[PDB]
RNA sequence: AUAAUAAUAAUAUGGUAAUAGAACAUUUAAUGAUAAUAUAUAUUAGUUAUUAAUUAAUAUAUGUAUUAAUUAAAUAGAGAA
RNA sequence: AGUAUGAAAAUGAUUAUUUUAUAAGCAAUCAUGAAUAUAUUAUAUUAUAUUAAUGAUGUACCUUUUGUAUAAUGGGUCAGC
């Protein structure tokens, strides 16, 4: 706490629980002249505001670093992990040598149906993503998979296709900010 | 990975340099036609010169046509007001001209109660959220 | 009978009272004159071709 | 006498005035004067210079005049002088715009990604925007023919005051465009005019007040609204954020549920925060958990990039875009 | 009055009052006053004086009215104009006389050009 | 045989009219408009051949006339250049043909009515499955592409006026 | 010592029966430029404190307003028999 | 009951846009989402127009009466008179 301003809710003269939308009550409410701390009643998702940016992303010579406004209201100890990879929970491992990688690559080309990504991962104690990064399958297998996917898509009704399109649009919208 | 979305800027006339909305006014009259008397008098009588001196960013065209006397303004937004000044005296014509020069060119429009400010800017405080409110509901 | 000089403030001006009919007549004369010029030239060219 | 001869001599006089842009004639032109007053251009910037800025290059009449049957006729403009057009000016104005606007953007957002920055620059000074600005100012195009003008018997002053390029008469008549080059487009001509004015301003003020041009630009071009947050479109932002954290002296980012409501409904709400250590980087709301996580990462990236330092701070040079 | 956080903040709003009518604004915002301004012509600048509240995202200075020294708030008068013309009819329930109450109120478009902590 | 590019600018109405169509018209049919409607609603957007077949096996009297009209429109389309298996009835309506002769009906106990005798015409516009239908399918596809999706926790406008004050 | 327009301060401005004052649309008569780049009528969208007129676009007519304006008059305004 | 012309309305069918199959009353007005159309200055986070999401207010008109949503008078609609 750098600043010791008095803090205020966004105060109505009326009952806020019954008349939150009534602007008139807000207009009526006068408060004594001076500086206040009105903490925002909002998530800081779309905001480029300087009171919203974290201190690590502020520059070293920024005066705003010292001021207490990027408030750490939440606590990482209390919050549980969401869609977190197994590498993040128990650390990244760089154990597999070149020979092992070469063997994996050989296996994958030979028989991707038998030696699938998950199986490789299980064998070598490593991620399916990493297996993918390491090794391409036989392009034939990929083509087959694409054809299967196309067939599945064709098997849809009109409605399902539209829903999938909508989902895709939503996904695109998520990454806009 | 990051990609741009092609987007264009919005001009706020006032904030940097004010470009005056009224760009051109056309005084139109008739030599015949008793409805154009006050307009004719205005054109004659040293008022137009004074006006032009006052407002050198507006150009003042003076045209002759057979019909009723006309005051057509021309604004920065591209819209055109045209006021017919038929049978108006000199002073009424001048008032009309003043009104025209005052106008920002935009179309006339019904406003609802307290529809005062028109912002392009995102809210300084955020938008309210029930999870992030100060007083939690019950 | 106002003019652009009459007002003495250079943003004011009076557009020229040329009657529509007069303009039309002028246009007719010019395009006609061009046509006459062209036709004579074509005739001359024909005569030259005939000669050699 | 002959009316053709009268027309011809008028045309010749007009051509001579275009070649010169004589100062007295330019001064007499009411439209130029009003433009000058409107923009509050310097008194050192003469009216001849302003007229020249409106004069686009037009040395020779093109081959497409030969056939109005193919959907084009260029009968409005008159040939210009090679060394008195807006062409050199225009280039200079473009350079100024490219320098100053870009610099201002960098000052505002010192970490802004390269592509995003370029888009912002374009938005500020794209050809269409420039044309719009010119229209707003009142730079009107010489649409009327030379013959028509002669018949009306209007002065050359008015012609000088208007914008002058090879504008195709019957451009979109009967709903038929011909798709010609940039040298016959109205928008382009208007863009050139606005750049040429800027260049003229620069030329006149540089020795007396070097920054006059840049403050004019700020007033007209940099005064326009552009929300930089609307410019971005991320792909796999979590990975990018992790890379950024690695690059800086920050702990690995992990996403965690802060608050949750309406799970097992049509429209839940999941608030997740991407923490690096105890510090939160990005806050992300969402209908799904995945969506919320994505949004937190995007928020973090926005905060990284769109960080705008104060003027009182010493200059922030960013360490490049986060190459994932 | 330690007005340092407000001064620092990139985003900033004001709640200036013209004739006790509050208008919440940022820079670039386009106020539409519901009356004909006589004092200022079009192009004239208005230095706002009765500024009630000056707010960041999380702080706000408030005063009745806030010291003129602490801030700037320049509006520009960007067109006097009018509302759309309306004619509501006034009449009683068994009476053929129907009085037309014509109306076309005046407006003044301001634009908030400058708003900053001095 | 030319290096000149072009871009064509056409209204919605212009687009509609220029697509290949054919305009059938009946003669002065002896019927009510209501009676015609009772049939013609069945032949809304049918292929012309299907419509003709329906008319052939309809029990109604106007039906034969409608069939004949359709046949004529097909013949016209063929003459123009179109195909009969391509043609569908885009529009088909009826109207009064005018000069309906009124005639008093004498009733019991010095009462009367007036009996009109309605004459009508059926017109119809045949358009092509090869063009018009394709165009409207394309339009529908474009509209679908444009359509903004249902977002669950989506940005809806905070409707209402602000009132010169923060409520949050 | 007036008229027009604009300021300031004050008072007034619901209205049936009724009284008083001021306008507009329509048609005819007297006077009367102009013109297909024009006029008239219609539709749509603008403009003027707006039963009215005007601007633009579009359509159809007409080589053209008994046109603007002032007077004189009226078979001069219809959801009510 | 002249001759031309006739996008005058009532009226019918059809197409397009838009709303409508859990919602109740002069069918409008005001608030207010959404969808569509037009827009040679939408620069847009744009503007206009059309359209019974949803909300609020709303007891046809005239006549005659102390007094009418009245279940008092009168009108099927529009055009001309
Ligand atoms: Mg209550
Ligand atoms: Mg009564
Ligand atoms: Mg009444
Ligand atoms: Mg008939
Ligand atoms: Mg009988
Ligand atoms: Mg009958
Ligand atoms: Mg009264
Ligand atoms: Mg009468
Ligand atoms: Mg009637
Ligand atoms: Mg009435
Ligand atoms: Mg329902
Ligand atoms: Mg019901
Ligand atoms: Mg009843
Ligand atoms: Mg009754
Ligand atoms: Mg009855």
Reported as half-sphere exposure (CB side, CA atoms, 13 A), residue A20 has a value of: 10
Q: How far is the CA of E84 from the C1' of H47 (A)?
A: 15
Q: Which residues of B touch D123 (CB under 8 A)?
A: 6-9
Residue F164's Cβ-side half-sphere holds a number of Cα atoms within 13 Å equal to 22
The angstrom resolution of this structure is 3.2
Contact B103, B132 (CB under 8 A): no
CA E12 to CA D202: how far, in whole Å? 34
Method: cryo-EM
Residues 6+ apart with CB under 8 A from D219: B16, B17
Query: What are B70's two structure tokens?
Result: 């006309």
| φ and ψ of F2, to 5 deg | -165, 150
- Which tokens is F35 given? 């009676």
D281 contacts A54 by C-beta, under 8 angstroms: yes
Q: Smallest Cα–Cα separation from C11: which of D276, D161, D318? A: D161
**Are E3 and E70 spatial neighbours (Cβ–Cβ below 8 Å)?**
yes
CA distance A17 to A20: 6
Q: Which two tokens stand for residue B5?
A: 């979305």
Residue with tokens 């634009």: E111
Which D-chain residues 235-264 have CB contacts (< 8 A) with chain B? 235-236, 240, 259, 261
CA–C1' F86–G7 (A)? 79
**CA–CA separation, F36 and E106 (whole Å):** 58
Phi-psi bin for A24: left (phi > 0), alpha (psi -120 to 50), beta? alpha
Other Cβ atoms less than 10 A from the Cβ of D258: the count is: 27
Q: How far apart are CA D99 and CA D221, in angstroms?
A: 13
- Reading the block at residue A82, the tokens are 């969401």
Residues 6+ apart with CB under 8 A from B56: C9, C11, D33, D34, D37
What is the Cα A66 distance to its own chain's centre? 28
DSSP E69: G
Nearest to A26 among F148, F160, F167 (CB): F167
Looking at chain E, the residues that come just before a C–N gap of over 2.5 A are none
Annotate D15-46 with b (16+ C-beta within 10 A) or e (fewer): bebbeebeeebbbbbbbbbbbbbbbebbeebb
- Residue D196 tokens, joined: 């040429």
Residue D182 CA to residue E1 CA, distance in Å, equals 59
Say how many Å lie between the CA of residue F106 and the centre of ligand 5: 7
Chain mean position to CA E29: 10
Distances (CA, A) of E60 to A1, D207, E112: 17, 45, 19
3-state secondary structure chain D: CCHHHHHHHHHHHHHHHHHHCCHHHHHHCHHHHHHHHHHCCCCCCCHHHHHHHHECCCCCCCHHHHCHHHCCECCCCCCCCCCCCCHHHHHHHHHHHHHHHHHHHHHHCCCCCHHHHHHHHHHHHCHHHHHHHHHHHCCCECCCCHHHHHHHCCCHHHHHHCEECCCCECCCHHHEECCCCHHHCHHHHHHHHHHHHHHHHHHHHCCCCCCHHHHHHHHHCCCCECCHHHHEEECCHHHHHHHHHHHCCCCCEEEEEEEEECCCCCCCEEEEEEEECCEEEEEEEECCHHHHHHHHHHHHHHHHHCCCCCCCCCCCCCCCCCCC
Report the alpha-carbon distance of residue F150 to residue D195 in Å, rounded. 44
Residue from D262, D322, D258 nearest D296 by CA: D258
List chain A residues with CB under 8 Å of D312.
63
Dihedral pair phi/psi, residue E25, rounded to 5°? -135, 155
Taking a C-beta distance cutoff of 8 angstroms, is the pair E14, E20 a contact?
A: no
Neighbouring C-beta atoms of residue E83, cutoff 10 Å = 16
- What is the distance in A from the centroid of ligand 3 to the CA of E82? 30
Query: Is residue C18 classed as helix, strand or coil in its secondary structure?
Result: coil
Q: How far is Cα E30 from Cα E12, in angstroms, rounded to an integer?
A: 15
Per the DSSP assignment, residues forming a β-bridge with F112 are F106
Residue nearest to nucleotide G55 (CA to C1'): B82
Distance H52 C1' – F94 CA (angstroms) = 29
Strand order from edge to edge, sheet including E51-55: A34-37, E59-62, E51-55, E13-18, E21-25
Q: Is E30 on the interface with F (CB under 8 A)?
A: no
Distances A107 to A93, A98, A121 between C-alpha atoms, Å: 22, 14, 12
| Residues F42, F50: Cα–Cα separation, whole Å | 11
**Apex CA D64: angle with CA D59 and CA D69, to 5°?**
150
User: Chain F residues with CB inside 8 Å of E21's CB?
Assistant: 164
- Ligand that lies nearest to the alpha carbon of residue E90, given by its number in the listed order: 3
Compute the 3-state secondary structure of chain B and give helix, strand, coil in percent, each to the nearest 5: 25, 20, 55
Q: Is the dihedral of CA F84, F86, F87, F88 positive or negative?
A: positive
Interface test with F, best of B122, B128, B131 (most F CBs within 10 A): B128
Asked if the bond preceding E65 is cis, omega within 30° of 0, the reply is yes
Residues 6+ apart with CB under 8 A from D143: D76, D167, D169
Contact D52, D204 (CB under 8 A): no
Q: Kindly provide the b/e burial profile for residues D61-73, where b requires at least 16 CB atoms within 10 angstroms of the residue's own CB.
A: eeebeeeeeebbb
Q: CB neighbours (10 Å) of residue C52?
A: 4
Given the DSSP bridges, would you call strands F111-115 and D269-276 parallel, antiparallel or unpaired?
unpaired
Q: What contacts F2, CB < 8 A, 6 or more positions away?
A: D70
- Run of H or E including B97: helix B90-102
Task: Give the single-character DSSP code of A64.
Answer: G
If one counts every other C-beta atom within 10 angstroms of the C-beta of residue D169, the result is 15
Give which of B49, B48, B53 is closest to B94, Cα–Cα: B48
The CA–CA distances, whole Å, from B93 to A62, B28, B51, B106, E42 equal: 60, 12, 13, 22, 20
The end-to-end CA distance of chain F, in Å, is 69
Rounded CA gap, D70 and D67, in Å?
6
From the CA of C12, how many Å to the nearest CA of chain D? Answer: 7
Give CA separation, B112 vs B116, E103, F83, F160, F166, in Å.
Answer: 9, 15, 58, 10, 19
Residue E89 host element (H or E):
strand E86-90
d(CA F116, CA B124): 75
Contact (CB, 8 A) for D47 and D36: yes
Three-state secondary structure call for residue E3: coil
**SS3 call for E82:** strand
The C-alpha angle with vertex B127 and arms to B126 and B128, in degrees rounded to 5, equals 110
CA D250 to chain centre: 40
Q: Which of D248, D283, D289 sits opposite A44 (nearest CB)?
A: D283
B-E C-beta contacts closer than 8 Å: 97
Q: Is the dihedral of CA E26, E30, E33, E36 positive or negative?
A: positive
């Amino acid at each position: 706490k750098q600043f010791g301003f008095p803090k205020t809710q966004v105060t109505t003269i009326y009952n806020k629980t019954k008349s939150a939308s009534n602007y008139k009550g807000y207009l009526k409410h006068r408060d004594a002249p001076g500086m206040y701390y009105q903490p925002s009643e909002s998530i800081a998702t779309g905001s480029v505001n300087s009171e919203t940016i974290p201190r690590s992303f502020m520059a070293a010579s920024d005066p705003r670093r010292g001021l207490d406004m990027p408030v750490q209201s939440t606590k990482a100890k209390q919050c549980p992990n969401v869609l977190v990879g197994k590498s993040t929970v128990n650390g990244k491992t760089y154990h597999l040598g070149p020979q092992e990688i070469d063997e994996i690559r050989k296996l994958r080309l030979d028989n991707p149906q038998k030696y699938t990504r998950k199986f490789l991962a299980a064998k070598y104690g490593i991620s399916p993503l990493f297996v993918s990064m390491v090794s391409k399958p036989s392009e034939q297998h990929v083509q087959i998979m694409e054809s299967r996917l196309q067939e599945i898509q064709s098997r849809w009704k009109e409605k399902r296709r539209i829903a999938r399109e909508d989902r895709k649009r939503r996904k695109l919208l998520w990454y806009q900010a | 990975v990051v990609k741009a979305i092609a987007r264009n800027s919005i001009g706020r006339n006032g904030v940097g340099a004010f470009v005056f909305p009224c760009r051109k006014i056309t005084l139109q009259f008739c030599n015949w036609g008793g409805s154009s008397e006050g307009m004719r008098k205005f054109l004659t009588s040293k008022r137009l010169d004074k006006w032009g001196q006052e407002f050198p960013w507006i150009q003042f065209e003076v045209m002759r046509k057979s019909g009723h006397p006309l005051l057509r303004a021309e604004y920065t937004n591209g819209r055109e007001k045209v006021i017919c000044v038929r049978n108006l005296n000199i002073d009424n014509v001048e008032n009309k001209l003043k009104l025209l020069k005052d106008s920002d060119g935009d179309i006339l429009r019904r406003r609802t109660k307290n529809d005062n400010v028109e912002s392009l800017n995102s809210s300084v405080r955020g938008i309210w959220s029930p999870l992030h409110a100060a007083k939690r509901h019950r | 009978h106002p003019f652009s000089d009459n007002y003495a403030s250079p943003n004011i001006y009076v557009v020229n009272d040329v009657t529509s009919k007069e303009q039309k007549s002028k246009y007719d004369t010019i395009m006609k004159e061009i046509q006459k010029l062209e036709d004579d030239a074509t005739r001359k060219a024909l005569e030259t071709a005939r000669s050699a | 006498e002959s009316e053709l001869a009268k027309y011809k001599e008028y045309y010749q006089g007009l051509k001579s005035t275009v070649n010169e842009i004589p100062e007295s004639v330019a001064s007499k032109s009411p439209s130029l004067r009003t433009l000058h007053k409107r923009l509050q251009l310097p008194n050192e910037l003469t009216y001849s210079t302003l007229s020249r800025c409106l004069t686009c290059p037009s040395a020779k009449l093109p081959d497409k005049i030969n056939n109005p049957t193919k959907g084009a006729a260029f009968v409005n403009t008159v040939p210009t002088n090679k060394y008195l057009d807006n062409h050199g000016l225009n280039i200079m104005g473009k350079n100024l715009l490219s320098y100053h606007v870009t610099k201002s953007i960098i000052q505002k957002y010192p970490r802004l990604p390269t592509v995003v920055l370029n888009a912002a620059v374009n938005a500020y000074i794209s050809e269409a925007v420039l044309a719009h600005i010119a229209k707003y100012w009142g730079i009107e195009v010489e649409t009327t023919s030379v013959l028509s003008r002669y018949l009306k018997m209007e002065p050359f002053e008015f012609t000088l005051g208007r914008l002058k390029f090879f504008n195709n008469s019957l451009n979109s008549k009967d709903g038929i465009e011909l798709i010609t080059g940039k040298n016959f487009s109205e928008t382009s001509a208007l863009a050139m005019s606005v750049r040429s004015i800027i260049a003229a301003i620069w030329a006149v003020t540089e020795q007396k007040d070097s920054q006059a041009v840049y403050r004019f630009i700020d007033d007209h071009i940099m005064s326009r609204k552009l929300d930089i947050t609307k410019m971005f479109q991320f792909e796999q932002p979590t990975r990018e954020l992790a890379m950024l954290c690695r690059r800086e002296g920050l702990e690995k980012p992990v996403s965690k549920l802060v608050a949750e409501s309406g799970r097992l409904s049509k429209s839940p709400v999941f608030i997740v925060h991407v923490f690096s250590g105890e510090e939160t980087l990005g806050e992300g709301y969402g209908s799904s958990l995945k969506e919320a996580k994505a949004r937190a990462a995007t928020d973090a990236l926005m905060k990284w990039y769109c960080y705008e330092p104060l003027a009182q701070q010493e200059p922030v040079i960013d360490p490049g875009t986060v190459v994932v | 009055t330690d007005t340092t956080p407000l001064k620092l903040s990139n985003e900033l709003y004001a709640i200036f009052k013209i004739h006790n009518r509050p208008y919440l604004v940022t820079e670039g915002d386009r106020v539409i006053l519901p009356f004909k301004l006589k004092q200022a012509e079009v192009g004239d600048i208005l230095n706002m004086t009765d500024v009630t509240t000056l707010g960041s995202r999380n702080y706000k200075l408030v005063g009745h009215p806030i010291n003129t020294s602490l801030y700037t708030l320049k509006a520009t008068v960007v067109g006097k104009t009018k509302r759309a013309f309306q004619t509501r009819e006034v009449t009683k329930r068994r009476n053929r006389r129907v009085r037309h109450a014509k109306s076309k109120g005046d407006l003044t478009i301001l634009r908030i050009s400058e708003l900053s902590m001095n | 045989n030319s290096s000149e590019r072009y871009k064509l600018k056409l209204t919605k109405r212009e687009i509609e009219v220029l697509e290949p169509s054919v305009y059938a018209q009946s003669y002065r049919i002896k019927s009510s408009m209501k009676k015609a409607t009772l049939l013609l609603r069945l032949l809304g957007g049918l292929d012309v051949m299907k419509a003709i077949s329906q008319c052939h096996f309809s029990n109604k009297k106007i039906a034969r006339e409608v069939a004949e009209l359709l046949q004529k429109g097909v013949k016209d389309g063929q003459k123009l250049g179109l195909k009969p298996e391509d043609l569908y009835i885009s529009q088909i309506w009826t109207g009064s043909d005018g000069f309906w002769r009124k005639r008093v009906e004498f009733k019991a106990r010095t009462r009367i009515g007036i009996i009109s005798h309605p004459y009508i015409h059926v017109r119809c516009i045949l358009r092509t499955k090869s063009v018009t239908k394709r165009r409207l399918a394309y339009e529908a596809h474009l509209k679908e592409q444009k359509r903004a999706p249902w977002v669950q926790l989506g940005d809806k406008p905070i409707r209402g006026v602000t009132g010169g004050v923060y409520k949050w």
